[PDB]
Amino acid sequence: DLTVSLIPVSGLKAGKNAPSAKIAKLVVNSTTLKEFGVRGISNNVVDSTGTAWRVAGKNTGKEIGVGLSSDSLRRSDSTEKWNGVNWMTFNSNDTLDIVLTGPAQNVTADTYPITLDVVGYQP
């Protein structure tokens, strides 16, 4: 199987944020599987691989754009299909960054939930 940790970044501040500001670290380890696929899960996924999506603040309902960082995307081993559904794959025993996507975002102070689905892949 896989052991997955998703770690929120400390010290995030409301207001204008840097482009691609890091917001969480994804850690996927395995003793048995060489690779994994990952997709964001929300009410508004915005690309065909599910590696960028939008999430709503708990207290305000305001939306922010989140996703894998461009560096993280460039570490993908491949994009594979599971019965037709795209999953970008990555080496296990790696970390990836989840960021604020696109140009600089102005973020209202709030708590924003993020959900990912991770699946093992044998190449």
Binding site: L2, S5, A24, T111, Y112, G120, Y121
Partner: peptide, 19 residues
């Protein structure tokens, strides 16, 4: 290649932006 359906996991966390 193949996906291992039984290995699929969902993980969720809260991201907090403070004033």
């Amino acid at each position: 290649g193949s996906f291992l359906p039984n290995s699929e996991q969902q993980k969720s966390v809260d991201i907090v932006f403070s004033s």
